[PDB]
Design a binder for this molecule. Sequence first.
Ligand SMILES: *[C@@H]1O[C@H](CO)[C@@H](O[C@@H]2O[C@H](CO)[C@@H](O[C@@H]3O[C@H](CO[C@H]4O[C@H](CO)[C@@H](O)[C@H](O)[C@@H]4O)[C@@H](O)[C@H](O[C@H]4O[C@H](CO)[C@@H](O)[C@H](O)[C@@H]4O)[C@@H]3O)[C@H](O)[C@H]2NC(C)=O)[C@H](O)[C@H]1NC(C)=O
Ligand SMILES: *[C@@H]1O[C@H](CO)[C@@H](O[C@@H]2O[C@H](CO)[C@@H](O[C@@H]3O[C@H](CO[C@H]4O[C@H](CO)[C@@H](O)[C@H](O)[C@@H]4O)[C@@H](O)[C@H](O[C@H]4O[C@H](CO)[C@@H](O)[C@H](O)[C@@H]4O)[C@@H]3O)[C@H](O)[C@H]2NC(C)=O)[C@H](O)[C@H]1NC(C)=O
Ligand SMILES: *[C@@H]1O[C@H](CO)[C@@H](O[C@@H]2O[C@H](CO)[C@@H](O[C@@H]3O[C@H](CO[C@H]4O[C@H](CO)[C@@H](O)[C@H](O)[C@@H]4O)[C@@H](O)[C@H](O[C@H]4O[C@H](CO)[C@@H](O)[C@H](O)[C@@H]4O)[C@@H]3O)[C@H](O)[C@H]2NC(C)=O)[C@H](O)[C@H]1NC(C)=O
Ligand SMILES: *[C@@H]1O[C@H](CO)[C@@H](O[C@@H]2O[C@H](CO)[C@@H](O[C@@H]3O[C@H](CO)[C@@H](O)[C@H](O)[C@@H]3O)[C@H](O)[C@H]2NC(C)=O)[C@H](O)[C@H]1NC(C)=O
Ligand SMILES: *[C@@H]1O[C@H](CO)[C@@H](O[C@@H]2O[C@H](CO)[C@@H](O[C@@H]3O[C@H](CO)[C@@H](O)[C@H](O)[C@@H]3O)[C@H](O)[C@H]2NC(C)=O)[C@H](O)[C@H]1NC(C)=O
Ligand SMILES: *[C@@H]1O[C@H](CO)[C@@H](O[C@@H]2O[C@H](CO)[C@@H](O)[C@H](O)[C@H]2NC(C)=O)[C@H](O)[C@H]1NC(C)=O
Ligand SMILES: *[C@@H]1O[C@H](CO)[C@@H](O[C@@H]2O[C@H](CO)[C@@H](O)[C@H](O)[C@H]2NC(C)=O)[C@H](O)[C@H]1NC(C)=O
Ligand SMILES: *[C@@H]1O[C@H](CO)[C@@H](O)[C@H](O)[C@H]1NC(C)=O
Ligand SMILES: *[C@@H]1O[C@H](CO)[C@@H](O)[C@H](O)[C@H]1NC(C)=O
Ligand SMILES: *[C@H]1O[C@H](CO)[C@H](O)[C@H](O)[C@H]1NC(C)=O
Ligand SMILES: *[C@H]1O[C@H](CO)[C@H](O)[C@H](O)[C@H]1NC(C)=O
Ligand SMILES: *[C@H]1O[C@H](CO)[C@H](O)[C@H](O)[C@H]1NC(C)=O
Ligand SMILES: [Ca+2]
Ligand SMILES: [Ca+2]
Ligand SMILES: [Ca+2]
Ligand SMILES: [Ca+2]
Ligand SMILES: [Ca+2]
Ligand SMILES: [Ca+2]
Ligand SMILES: [Ca+2]
Ligand SMILES: [Ca+2]
Ligand SMILES: [Ca+2]
Ligand SMILES: [Ca+2]
Ligand SMILES: [Ca+2]
Ligand SMILES: [Ca+2]
Ligand SMILES: [Ca+2]
Ligand SMILES: [Ca+2]
Ligand SMILES: [Ca+2]
Ligand SMILES: [Ca+2]
Ligand SMILES: [Ca+2]
Ligand SMILES: [Ca+2]
Ligand SMILES: [Ca+2]
Ligand SMILES: [Ca+2]
Lengths: 1077, 361, 5
Amino acid sequence: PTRPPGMCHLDEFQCQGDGTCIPNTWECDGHPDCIHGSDEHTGCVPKTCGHSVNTCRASQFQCDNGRCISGNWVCDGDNDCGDMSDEDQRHHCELQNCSSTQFTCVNSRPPNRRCIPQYWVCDGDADCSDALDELQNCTMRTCSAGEFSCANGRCVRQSFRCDRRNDCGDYSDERGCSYPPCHANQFTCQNGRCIPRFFVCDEDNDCGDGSDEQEHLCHTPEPTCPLHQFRCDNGHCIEMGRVCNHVDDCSDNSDEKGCGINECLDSSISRCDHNCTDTITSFYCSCLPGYKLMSDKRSCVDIDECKESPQLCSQKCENVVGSYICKCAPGYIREPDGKSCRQNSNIEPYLIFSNRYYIRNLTTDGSSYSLILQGLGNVVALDFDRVEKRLYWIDAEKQIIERMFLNKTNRETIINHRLRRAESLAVDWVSRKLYWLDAILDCLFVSDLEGRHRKMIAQHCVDANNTFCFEHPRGIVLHPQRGHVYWADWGVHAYIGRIGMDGTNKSVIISTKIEWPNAITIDYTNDLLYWADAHLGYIEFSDLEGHHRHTVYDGSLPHPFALTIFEDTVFWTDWNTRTVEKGNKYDGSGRVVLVNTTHKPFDIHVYHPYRQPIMSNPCGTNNGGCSHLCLIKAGGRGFTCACPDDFQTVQLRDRTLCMPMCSSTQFLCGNNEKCIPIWWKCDGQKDCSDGSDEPDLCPHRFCRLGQFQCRDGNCTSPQALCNARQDCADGSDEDRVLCEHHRCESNEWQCANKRCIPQSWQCDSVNDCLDNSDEDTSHCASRTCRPGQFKCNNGRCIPQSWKCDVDNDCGDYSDEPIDECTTAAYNCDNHTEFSCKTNYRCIPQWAVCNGFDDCRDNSDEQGCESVPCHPSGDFRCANHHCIPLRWKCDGTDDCGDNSDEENCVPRECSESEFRCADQQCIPSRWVCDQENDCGDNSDERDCEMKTCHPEHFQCTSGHCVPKALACDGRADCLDASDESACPTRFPNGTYCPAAMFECKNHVCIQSFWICDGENDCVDGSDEEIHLCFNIPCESPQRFRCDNSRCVYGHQLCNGVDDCGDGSDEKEEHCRKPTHKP
Amino acid sequence: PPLLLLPENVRIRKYNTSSEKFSEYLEEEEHIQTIDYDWDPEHIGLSVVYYTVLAQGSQFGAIKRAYIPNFESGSNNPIREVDLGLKYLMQPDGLAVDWVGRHIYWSDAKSQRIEVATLDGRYRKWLITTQLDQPAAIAVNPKLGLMFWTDQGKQPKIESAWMNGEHRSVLVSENLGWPNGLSIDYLNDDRVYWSDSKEDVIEAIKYDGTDRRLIINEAMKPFSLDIFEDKLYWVAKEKGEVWRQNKFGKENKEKVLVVNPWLTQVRIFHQLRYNQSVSNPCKQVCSHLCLLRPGGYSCACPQGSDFVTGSTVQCDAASELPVTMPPPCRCMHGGNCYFDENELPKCKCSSGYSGEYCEVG
Amino acid sequence: XXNXX
Ligand SMILES: *[C@@H]1O[C@H](CO)[C@@H](O[C@@H]2O[C@H](CO)[C@@H](O[C@@H]3O[C@H](CO[C@H]4O[C@H](CO)[C@@H](O)[C@H](O)[C@@H]4O)[C@@H](O)[C@H](O[C@H]4O[C@H](CO)[C@@H](O)[C@H](O)[C@@H]4O)[C@@H]3O)[C@H](O)[C@H]2NC(C)=O)[C@H](O)[C@H]1NC(C)=O
Ligand SMILES: *[C@@H]1O[C@H](CO)[C@@H](O[C@@H]2O[C@H](CO)[C@@H](O[C@@H]3O[C@H](CO[C@H]4O[C@H](CO)[C@@H](O)[C@H](O)[C@@H]4O)[C@@H](O)[C@H](O[C@H]4O[C@H](CO)[C@@H](O)[C@H](O)[C@@H]4O)[C@@H]3O)[C@H](O)[C@H]2NC(C)=O)[C@H](O)[C@H]1NC(C)=O
Ligand SMILES: *[C@@H]1O[C@H](CO)[C@@H](O[C@@H]2O[C@H](CO)[C@@H](O[C@@H]3O[C@H](CO[C@H]4O[C@H](CO)[C@@H](O)[C@H](O)[C@@H]4O)[C@@H](O)[C@H](O[C@H]4O[C@H](CO)[C@@H](O)[C@H](O)[C@@H]4O)[C@@H]3O)[C@H](O)[C@H]2NC(C)=O)[C@H](O)[C@H]1NC(C)=O
Ligand SMILES: *[C@@H]1O[C@H](CO)[C@@H](O[C@@H]2O[C@H](CO)[C@@H](O[C@@H]3O[C@H](CO)[C@@H](O)[C@H](O)[C@@H]3O)[C@H](O)[C@H]2NC(C)=O)[C@H](O)[C@H]1NC(C)=O
Ligand SMILES: *[C@@H]1O[C@H](CO)[C@@H](O[C@@H]2O[C@H](CO)[C@@H](O[C@@H]3O[C@H](CO)[C@@H](O)[C@H](O)[C@@H]3O)[C@H](O)[C@H]2NC(C)=O)[C@H](O)[C@H]1NC(C)=O
Ligand SMILES: *[C@@H]1O[C@H](CO)[C@@H](O[C@@H]2O[C@H](CO)[C@@H](O)[C@H](O)[C@H]2NC(C)=O)[C@H](O)[C@H]1NC(C)=O
Ligand SMILES: *[C@@H]1O[C@H](CO)[C@@H](O[C@@H]2O[C@H](CO)[C@@H](O)[C@H](O)[C@H]2NC(C)=O)[C@H](O)[C@H]1NC(C)=O
Ligand SMILES: *[C@@H]1O[C@H](CO)[C@@H](O)[C@H](O)[C@H]1NC(C)=O
Ligand SMILES: *[C@@H]1O[C@H](CO)[C@@H](O)[C@H](O)[C@H]1NC(C)=O
Ligand SMILES: *[C@H]1O[C@H](CO)[C@H](O)[C@H](O)[C@H]1NC(C)=O
Ligand SMILES: *[C@H]1O[C@H](CO)[C@H](O)[C@H](O)[C@H]1NC(C)=O
Ligand SMILES: *[C@H]1O[C@H](CO)[C@H](O)[C@H](O)[C@H]1NC(C)=O
Ligand SMILES: [Ca+2]
Ligand SMILES: [Ca+2]
Ligand SMILES: [Ca+2]
Ligand SMILES: [Ca+2]
Ligand SMILES: [Ca+2]
Ligand SMILES: [Ca+2]
Ligand SMILES: [Ca+2]
Ligand SMILES: [Ca+2]
Ligand SMILES: [Ca+2]
Ligand SMILES: [Ca+2]
Ligand SMILES: [Ca+2]
Ligand SMILES: [Ca+2]
Ligand SMILES: [Ca+2]
Ligand SMILES: [Ca+2]
Ligand SMILES: [Ca+2]
Ligand SMILES: [Ca+2]
Ligand SMILES: [Ca+2]
Ligand SMILES: [Ca+2]
Ligand SMILES: [Ca+2]
Ligand SMILES: [Ca+2]
């Protein structure tokens, strides 16, 4: 056994004063053993041994204001009492059922009466709120060409359009209008309504949404009565030159209501829990430090200084009645100052952070700056493993997840399939699992560290209310000590979500004052969640339950994306300045920019043993007894068996059974360990651990890796399978037995013919399944919009953010009901949203001054010179728009006036880039690759002396191709040198099967390519006339030239001699044969 | 009298300095930069000129050679060009030819190198490839075994070294703007001259780099130089005119020609400019290349190849055969050229003239 | 927009 670095044995106590260890029996034994008595903490208990204005009459109704009205008009739908006292459910109007034969237009709402007399039914007047009384039993109207014809059927004049009034019933008059702004004196509401200025702050919701009753513009701060003003109890404060002057300045001598001042000299009266102090007429209470005056003004309560103000302790805090004490987590020693904790293990930390093309290893002071790996595609995520000294990352360019040891050895790829958009990952060092978010499948995944047994644990939406869903997942952090997974979402309903490590207990943590939570992480010492916002530009931390939020940086950050904390310092990566920088983790003091990164630094981590704390594994040995994933249960104590994604979990009497549900288009391995796509079967590369994916009777592989081979030597991409199109020439891609159980990916919906299309495309008024299945009327009538989406009457589905955004999205206008779209429930958020002046939609703040009309009325683009750009990481264009500094001199016009690129100096290329003639940068991978990339073809210049990278096969012409593209039966170099030296691929001397024509130089092609004018193989034997004399040179498809060579298809009379004797560009064959027979 | 050579972006024009009229030469070409010539190596009466081509778009530049008549005048001759096969050329701003050893010198401004190869351009090798920003035109002095080159980037410099790439040194680095052209006075103790497109002056200095002198000032943006007899030649780039002045800088600026701004260089075509009487110091012992040096010679290998271990003469790389040259139209004294089925240049003599190539009559 | 990689 060992003593872990800086830590102590399991049954040992650590002296917080200096880090020395003592036996457990020594702590709380009654004797101070440590240097500072940390072993004898307070947490251990000692040893044990005219009548009335509204009296009215029996026939008259009574009103609060003092009026008397006839009882006939009570609850008739309109105020008769003059104070609404006859028109409320407060006293009684719930059963206001009206008299006899009145038509009950239930479309009407309390702003109007549903019952309408038949005296004016069908009279040509809109009695009901949508004028249904004019169609229910009424003779039709011919209407006029000079009047506005409502699309519903009503007829009105043009004066009844664009006026906020539903004259047509179906709002056809007000729909599509472009109301001009309000007048000079007129007040404007959030929903664009115009109301008279006098109607502000009168307890009536005249704006509809409550704009005229907003607290900020309505509340009048009472005269403060500052210094040189004595605030008397009456509120009409005077100068203190008049205190107790015996002249009644404030009503009933409130200024002289008491002049003894010293009212504290008693116990029952004035009752103050702790201390008392007199005032100019009375007393007031006060508390000792560490105590809070509660709401009663007559007592003192102890505050939880650890929860209220965590910045008082560098680490784990312990509350005391009246004070607090700062402890340090195991492995840290408490400094003599009594607050700061210092790491003890001699392993000093360093920052591992990832760039475009790079992963870099940076010391926490900026003195050392090295390179871990280079030449990667795009490393957007990264994490480490303390137990095995491993490193993991996501290469978003190639959509794979790699892993390697920290000493540059044994680079492997664990997960390489079905990765559409993985934005972040985290390594579970406890139960040996890997987590990563998918931003396209909109889910959360869990897997074994080696790559097997992928499983979903989160999807759809989080709350029971279906408001926050997986729009744009980004950023993930694990807290395996309590079995929780925290991830951030930067969708339109941005939030921070939590879920148990087995998928139970998903809930919402933080969903307010947040727009772009790119970063997220947890401090494992004091147990405080940390995150940052890219839009609001803050760094905030809070308890693990989303309570007691505190702000470190307040709007001073351009664009954080990732952050990590070690000791008392927080390190974060800034996109706009393209820098990695650090500051104190509680107040932000000591900000230092550590490194100028040329590319955006995406993900950052602190590699130290203490950043992955140790504790016992719940699935201790035997994998918890499960043949499959043993996951940590919510709460961190228990564990839960689970099966992979393509399996069915069936529960036995007392233990779990996993049944394979491999679909028809997939192959199940012999040991039933995993289910893999059918085109992975017989591909030549062993995928299943038992080798069953490669049987003994494998046909010869004509197709590449990742390609489906038809039943007869033909190839197609996997997407061709069961897409209701004859893709394989034989047609095996549409075979019944192959497609009969073609269950496909979750995020798309399957048609009747079992072709499946993206889920949103169904019921969008376009036949997408080619069998009209997605446009079936009954299906659209009977289906359901996926969680977090609104359902149209058309049957279409739209995101919740498109409801009440003015613009129609459902075809029919059920997505924009103006009766609902103007109430107070749809006010803009004053932090992250900007309200349009005229239209009622709300748009995000970053959309303001971008060169695009998001508000549909140029509200967001008007007055752009008033917006000041960010001082630290923003650049201002000529047209006064703000752009990220990272887009300046990037090579493209980014604000519409070339101002970002005016007077631009070229940048110096990084360690893995080659500089073209015109001083632009391209990756070293693009040098000598048989394609033009520098414009002047400079990447291919002088490609004879340079080496190829170890995984690239050098062509004899000096260019480089990946070594997997040699000895395959096709030319990959531009001179077929990759196949030229390859050995005989068959004992009988040939190079490819009998179904293929074989050229001279071991490259070989399909039969149908012979004699087509295309030089299919270099040094082409295909264009050999002698062997091609007897091929079907038939007139309907081939032009048989005079020299007996035949010309493929449209090449006849094309303008260039494809024959070789001049008669290709001639007459009598491409001219009129018999003048259009 | 000397014959002038002036390359334009599309065509090459030669002008007799005494007959005062132009004559026909190579046509139908694109993006040529600079020219240099070798005086009738086979002594039949036709010299060899070497002209490079810049590149646009996908295709790369190249170096080509063509024949020029040494007699009084020649016309209607179908001059044919041949490519040396030197691939991967971006901007050959400077080219020079060494008549002693059959070597060609050129520098790539974009590649920031100076190359070397045989007259057919097979045994390619980099001579100097370090610490160059934008290498300008070059010059060669086989008699003293020193080649000259300049830089026009952030650090304008003029340098010289041996023909085998060693003993590199800087001549001057002060009071220099944008050097553009180089010339050596072979008769005046091997004095060297250079121009400046920013200072607008032409200066001279000895080969070792002593006694710098300002010869002429306010030359209206000179581009290239040439010294013959006792006069200096330069061309105003922004106007296209050609001028003469005493090479000692004590005479008026005489005017010669006015040409379009596509003019790139002025070069004098005369045997006395190069003094072909210089003998070859090489012993024909080297395997691939026999470069020159002051008082001796040296052997070299093609680029990316080394000598066999222990030896310093034999290279590891293979040796390719030389490239044949097409025959020219030697037709003299107003004759015409014609190609038969054998495609030989069978001349058509004019009235009163007889013989194979119609020499006299 | 401005956050997508
Ligand atoms: C870069 O860094 C990596 C990781 O640090 C190095 O890889 C390690 O290499 C060592 C050997 O130097 C490996 O040690 C060997 O591991 C075997 C398997 O152990 C696994 O299973 C056990 C038990 O469950 C786990 O504890 C362990 O973590 C592994 O999962 C052992 O069986 C070997 O022991 C055998 O040999 C030793 C003597 O060497 C005997 O004493 C034993 O009795 C036994 O016969 C051995 O310990 C280690 O597994 C590798 N890393 C890991 C964690 O996998 C690279 O070598 C290093 N590269 C360079 C070039 O420095
Ligand atoms: C991808 O899928 C295509 C589908 O076309 C395949 O192309 C076929 O390839 C086979 C050879 O492997 C061809 O078979 C030949 O057919 C000739 C008659 O063609 C008629 O019948 C075939 C079906 O059998 C129809 O497809 C076609 O439209 C015609 O109706 C026969 O005369 C040939 O036999 C003669 O030659 C053979 C040797 O090749 C001798 O042994 C025989 O004795 C005889 O002399 C031969 O059977 C077939 O015609 C091709 N189809 C077409 C339309 O061209 C591709 O093979 C496959 N991918 C690859 C590259 O393998
Ligand atoms: C050098 O050696 C290679 C083999 O190493 C020879 O190539 C073989 O050529 C023969 C004859 O053309 C091919 O046999 C035919 O294959 C067709 C399709 O492939 C079947 O076999 C593969 C396995 O190889 C299966 O995986 C696949 O699903 C197919 O079942 C068949 O359609 C042909 O069937 C016809 O003949 C058989 C009897 O052989 C009858 O039972 C059928 O009814 C039908 O009449 C036939 O079997 C063979 O596939 C080729 N093998 C390979 C791998 O190339 C070369 O011909 C030889 N050198 C030369 C150039 O001669
Ligand atoms: C604010 O509150 C505290 C607590 O009410 C008041 O503290 C009082 O302080 C005095 C001096 O420390 C204490 O008196 C002393 O007590 C000791 C015995 O403990 C005695 O030996 C000394 O001779 C002396 O009498 C007093 O006990 C303490 N109050 C109580 C009730 O414990 C303080 O005065 C208050 N101050 C203000 C600003 O009102
Ligand atoms: C990132 O950079 C830092 C510092 O440049 C690297 O830290 C260094 O890592 C090496 C390898 O573990 C250490 O070398 C070893 O030192 C011990 C003595 O301490 C010696 O006995 C061993 O033989 C070996 O030389 C080095 O001490 C260590 N330095 C510090 C201050 O930690 C770090 O490894 C780099 N990270 C990566 C993954 O590149
Ligand atoms: C989920 O949505 C429901 C329905 O809108 C919310 O419940 C109502 O919220 C409104 C807010 O004005 C109240 O007027 C109602 O009294 C609430 N109760 C019901 C049952 O209608 C609910 O608050 C939302 N979820 C959460 C957790 O906020
Ligand atoms: C399951 O989820 C609920 C809600 O997230 C958790 O309930 C919280 O528990 C903490 C104590 O741990 C309380 O202080 C909070 O007030 C609770 N919130 C609510 C609204 O219930 C519960 O702890 C979770 N349990 C497990 C095992 O994960
Ligand atoms: C980062 O860039 C600034 C100029 O933008 C430069 O002055 C500074 O030296 C760089 N970083 C450091 C601290 O070296
Ligand atoms: C405006 O934003 C502040 C931020 O603290 C918030 O407290 C306030 O409630 C917001 N105003 C309204 C009307 O919601
Ligand atoms: C231990 O002794 C203390 C002495 O103050 C108390 O009596 C306490 O109640 C005792 N605890 C038990 C469990 O008896
Ligand atoms: C539609 O809603 C039903 C429940 O009403 C199911 O949740 C179904 O899965 C939903 N369909 C989609 C596409 O999510
Ligand atoms: C190809 O032919 C060679 C001899 O030329 C060998 O026999 C070799 O084994 C053959 N290829 C295979 C795969 O057997
Ligand atoms: Ca003790
Ligand atoms: Ca009423
Ligand atoms: Ca009516
Ligand atoms: Ca209206
Ligand atoms: Ca009001
Ligand atoms: Ca008073
Ligand atoms: Ca306290
Ligand atoms: Ca998504
Ligand atoms: Ca938002
Ligand atoms: Ca921002
Ligand atoms: Ca396989
Ligand atoms: Ca298909
Ligand atoms: Ca559709
Ligand atoms: Ca909408
Ligand atoms: Ca906008
Ligand atoms: Ca730009
Ligand atoms: Ca390229
Ligand atoms: Ca190949
Ligand atoms: Ca062909
Ligand atoms: Ca043609």
